[model samples]
Target: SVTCPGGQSTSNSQCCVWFDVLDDLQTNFYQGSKCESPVRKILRIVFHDAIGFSPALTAAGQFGGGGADGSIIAHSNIELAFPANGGLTDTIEALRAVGINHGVSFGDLIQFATAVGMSNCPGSPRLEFLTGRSNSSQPSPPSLIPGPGNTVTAILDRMGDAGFSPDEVVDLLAAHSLASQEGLNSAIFRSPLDSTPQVFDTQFYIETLLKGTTQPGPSLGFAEELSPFPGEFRMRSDALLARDSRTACRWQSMTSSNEVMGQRYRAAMAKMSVLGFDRNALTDCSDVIPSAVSNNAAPVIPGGLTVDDIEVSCPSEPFPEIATASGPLPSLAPAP
Candidate 1:
């Protein structure tokens, strides 16, 4: 007996406690109706906060910062100062205001905000969410977050240490499907990670395979990293993993179908979301998460590139014959 966003019908009001909070988050944060940078930032922060967990750190007699806890939210002074967290000040502060006002725990608020924000975009998975996570005991350790600078083996090892397998790590990276590279470079202040910035899809998997087109700006330690298209900033990690013996086939598999990407990402996030907490201890509020608008576009190479342009690395299996878009040379717009 409650009104849901987009006329979503629901008989259970268990989650109605969050209805107004959802409205506030979506209204104030999501840029219009598309999956823009704000939405991407919310999603990225979820991983950044959660990935800080390491039982190994504790076993090694180190302060294993709270896993998937809201340390970054509560310990902004210490945690946000990390170089890896650059460009998240505005995004974190914005979420902080909404979370504090709602009386929600920082852990739950961040994950809930991610589910709500991604739902605003088409083709995004309906992320599962659970409430009742406690706040950070302490901020997660610095440099725990890996990025394009990490090699495929190094990135995979870090994720493995955090309890995620190579496939799960790749699946989780599908979040990049909706992310933007903000503040990383002055020339391309807000470059989209893939050509299709407006919708979440498997295009990122295919596009990451294309040979370098042009750099959005100057390059430095970006030898491994190359933009696949003008205005499109490809993560070096994605490029390297796509060809690695350990993770190549799985990375290339998503190009075969959007459902595969959606399925894998949803499963990965569900696990990634509750990393530090006991699953039974959390109340499942997943039904309250809105389903994304369906994306009818088949997984295809972005318009303007021929199949020959794809540097397919999968020799074990033939790469899917993904159709190429026919039109003018594709140009990506900077995410505002």
Candidate 2:
């Protein structure tokens, strides 16, 4: 549905989720004026202004920790201080305003905004949203995040550093389906995105099967193994999945050998981000502030937000086009 054949972006809702905090803090990032309104009118200068500049907070559990309890997914917030999360303070800052206006705390805003983005944006799970959260100035522990720089052994050790099992780590990596490198963070893979971008499918695993190639970016670089690149993911598990060793055998059980395993795994991707904590994790969280001035809002429907709702606030926005070459993400639009 390229509503505008040659538009900047298809709609405001599209822009809304595309630049939300999830992508804001990660292996890569986006930069533009679209980051303006949500960062300003909603998040405020104190928080929104630093949307993607704070390395400490942004680096938290870049493995995808930071979701609230009952979210069914692991929170990437734990990596808030890691190297990959460098320069993402702006995301944390901007979410502050969105959270305040929603009568929810900053914690609630971060999770809610992500949910909105995943649901409305191209190639996301469209997970449900639940509010009521309290933020913690106290972080978990230092050395909590595992860097992609680690070998298979170190990768496993880092997972232990964060209290996750090998299988759990495998489950979490599934979050790759919803991502692309904004600045290039790794020297693995073929390009900014896996084979299938803008669609939350098993391309993450499928690519691993082919032993893909990598492309260079500001932060990360892509790699190659398979004869035809863009075929497999080339992660540690990829080799094991094809082997018959004890550890490999154990890993295979997590996803099973079924062809539909990727689909089943993806089914739980959004849920896994929340990590089953629910409202019990918050302490005395009772608030929901209204926005002083809301910008880029769309109409609401009784059941769910329609494509029209997304296009209403800003029609000039156009759909994302695939890149011609392997590299970091292409450009996005600015705010009006």
Candidate 3:
């Protein structure tokens, strides 16, 4: 006999508690029930929180921050002030309130919100969710999170320590499909990573393959990732990895099929969500996660684009004759 927020009811109030988190997220965080800036922030915050642990570094008796332990929210004073975590303040505050309102653990709140957030983005899968994460507030080491400017070697090595393979790293990069950059250039706020910033799709892979033109803002970006579309920005690491012989195939392969792309992305997300805690110990409450919404649009090259623009690296398979749109594409604006 329990009622979730927004008048929702459930058999187990404990399980139903997640619905309240969902209510708050949809109301306050998702930018008016649409997938926008806040959605990307929530998605990335989970990664920043989970990627802080390293097995080898911990075994060496050095400070290896607890991975996926809600440390970012629990130890906000220390981790939030870290330079790598800049731009995450609003996201942390939003989730912190949701966590406290329903007695949800900070770790669970971060990951659960991400799963729900991804589901709202059309074409992205409903990521798995697990409850019962401990409320330990230990802060993670500040150095674990990587940035766009980092060389592929440095970025890969750091991610490698966090139990992600090169292929998995590419898979995770799919998140950029729904992302926008604000701080990359103060003047160029909300520059979309791909043509379709509003939808979750493989345009990220296809677009990154095109030649980079110029900076969207007056001041040059630290990433200088070379986006072809006006007002679009790419991460240097993403650009480098797309051309790299080692990871290019995986990056290119994603452009092949939307179904396969979603499959791989969800698998990688599941692996990422539970880094420090054992899956067997956590209760499976994935039912509360909403179903993914389809974009209802095929993955086509945006308007006024042709095949010659793409720089293909995967030799084994031919790039499909994905249909092209009619006319020129306009530059994107900052997300609301």
Candidate 4:
């Protein structure tokens, strides 16, 4: 095992046991039922917790800003109040028990679960894991996280403050492809952001650039709501990033190849996962498992599927056409 500067000594390492618990859980719950919710929820939890760190916020009196210190999980009531964080309570609870059982720290559990969850999907790169994160006893400032209603400039500022570049922001947002939310879908079955929601792919960039539009609806101004437009839904931040001149080219390019997208996503996630920690604080846990592998295969979507195919498949939110389009993407609607 590769040692991190502050990593657990060889005899004290729980990395292998942690993966063992993850595998058992995945086999019993995730694979057995083919449920995607647990994986999606874990992924979201990791992001929310990761972005909770910010140098600006820390300077302003936030505790441990920019560190994946389990603030989001420990301070659930405060962080979950954010609209984007609404559905993650159950996931946090489940993982908390898992962490306790395996002697994993909250920070490690959050990112580890996220890596494992992403592996449940196909086309996602095997993310490297780092250990030796310290847990936080307090919550990060709620304002540190940008809402979906935020604009391109606003999102850029927030991301920059958190140490992400414009192109990286686009890559980060692509994680939405793994999501299913009430705002994106009906009460029946949650709508996925892309055609292959079950698989990790650049399809999110493809869908956002081509099919996203801010049509009027109850969801307008309420960034979490699904678009009123048929076969499409547009969140303010997603649409805005796609429309921005600076990021538009890179966003479109994300759709060109799965390899590039996977590489970028993994690199971005590795950076995101370790936000706020001193570079020397972590030990590489990559040896425990290069990345978690899944027993279940990615789901197959029928070739001829289109409008009705999406509707019948898992509730409708029309996926974008495969061929990439040139020119600027659509702008976000002004918040009402």
Candidate 5:
């Protein structure tokens, strides 16, 4: 039994326990090899679900324009075909059990797991958690979702259309640096977005500025690699953002200082968490945990590199060939 916080317009004793269950899930069930973690997978799900929002469709009364409706997870197979969502199938499957047990809507589960997962990362902020998301009965319509190969102009235009500013775009992309091709299958492992793929830091910006190449890979076809620097991968879109004049300064500012990245990243994540959903209609579970907490002290499964309780630095020059061991994977790159 858990105590539901007193200020919500609607309250549930069960609602409070969801966060507790989330703690257990993150601690025990979300283990991964190398850079894979519950945090990274949850963040990807949150973005995939949230970025589906479109003002044009919402106004026209067409499918509620995605948003935090949980369409992606609910219709996982449809989304998996996109290539962008390659590694997320298992992540979605794991959440379904908890969502059903807690009586938490699919939409709420997606974003809530995201909030809880953020605490696992040292630099991530304590995001404001809210509930009351409506699940979509159908899949989201195919829209202008940006991919790894999109140019700066194309990416920005799509983001602008989806209602994001230049700065938000940069901050959101920063989250990408936190993820890599760790536990993922043949597709996503083509490369990581930054040198330190497991940690949330300014290394993404610093490294992107220093080294990023638009090279073809087995998985995504078009990916950025850090040749001189080892074990770093870049999305084509991320390299473009660093090279684009519109976002260069903001992108550059994050390289030398994590303070600005933290401040901006938190704000941007909070904003992204609630794209099309109305805040007033949601339940406030923000007080479930007062500070950033992690279950890192728990026993970790032995592996190549444990996601928890590991502080190894990013690999240096002469990056060894890890992808070659897996043989040639299918081309999963999305259309440009």
Candidate 6:
């Protein structure tokens, strides 16, 4: 159960639990005239971050399957709200009043809020996230998600235009490893962030140098050779950089050293966070009332009206209900 320090309406609970709060805002998406307003913008902020972090959670074993008590659907929901939820959830929650009023789903708000954060932040380049997939009352199939052990080159190819290359892939994994802990899956050979448990940095490389080994060593190490950017070989760019034509020129221009590799990788992360989803499309949920007429269509497994048509009649800054508890985390980057 969630612990509330202070008390309802006065306690600081709302300050921390963004997922639960955002989850409350997804009842009405796209059915009437309110759909034309600022609801989308408000939602994008929540979606961007949620989506970007989903892969990280899945990769970290924090989610997906039974790894962290998550299924593809369960992970899709909780991972977005996980404290490692990066810094987006609180921001989106602060906008809850608007989001709730606008008809964004907990899933939709979570996903789109991340999108807005990505568009506003860095590391991504306008990757379009679609709405329409609804939440399941139950979890998705256990095997619906991907796992580690996939080759780096092939992984990048399958990852599609997330635009992550070999080096960027390693770097992205490095960033993810920061707050991530290792688990017992046979595919997972090592922990990514053993030292810097929370901050983002290149220390993962150094850790690999000192203690990394074959078949997942104790520290933040993986099957380096299995990847395009081998995580095992010391002082090798091939270990730091992977093959992606888009990143090829930048890789060529890089100093061709581990230090340069780490820095470029960091820069790549800063760039990747902001990919996809236009901010202009963002909307506010200042006032959300029930749709005059709900969409009569049969709800698909993951069903709902598309994000493009959500009614956003009332637009204003966010004002949420008081939480029933107190929390250590503060509210930031909220929708207005």
Q: Pick the candidate with the highest lDDT.
A: 3
Best by TM-score: 3
Superior candidate under TM-score, 2 versus 5 = 5
lDDT against the true structure, per candidate, is 0.80, 0.34, 0.82, 0.64, 0.62, 0.32
**TM per prediction:** 0.93, 0.47, 0.93, 0.77, 0.75, 0.33
Candidate 2 residue-wise lDDT at 31: 33
* Candidate 4 collision pairs: 4-283, 53-66, 54-66, 66-275, 66-276
lDDT score of residue 247 within candidate 5:
82
lDDT of 3 by residue, 1-336 (tens): 656665665555567778777878887778556887778998778899999998878899987877888999888889988767889987788778878887889998888888877887788887888888899857797788898888888888998999889999999989989988877777888888887887888898988887777567786777776578778887788889998877888988888588888889889888988898898988777778878778778877775777888888777777778878887865767654
- The residue pairs in collision within model 3 are none
Candidate 5 TM-score versus the reference: 0.75
- The per-residue C-alpha lDDT of model 4 at residue 175 equals 82
lDDT (10s digit) by residue, model 6, range 43-64:
3233233223234435677542
Please list the residue runs of candidate 2 whose C-alpha ends up more than 4 Å from where it truly belongs after superposition: 1-81, 121-128, 160-163, 184-190, 212-336
- Which residue ranges in model 1 land beyond 4 Å of their true spot? 1-14, 31-34, 218-224
Question: lDDT score, residue 121, model 4?
Answer: 70
Root-mean-square deviation of each candidate, in angstroms? 2.5, 15.8, 2.2, 8.4, 9.7, 20.7
Q: Which ten residues in a row have the lowest lDDT in candidate 6?
A: 298-307
Model 5 clashes, total count: 0
Task: For residues 151-171, write the lDDT of model 4, one tens digit per residue.
Answer: 778888888988999989978
User: Candidate 5: which stretches are off by over 4 Å?
Assistant: 1-15, 32-35, 58-64, 182-190, 212-220, 225-228, 293-336
Decoy 2 TM-score against native: 0.47
lDDT of 2 by residue, 175-284 (tens): 44444433233433223233433334444443332222332223323322332232223333333332323234333333222224334444443343333235444332
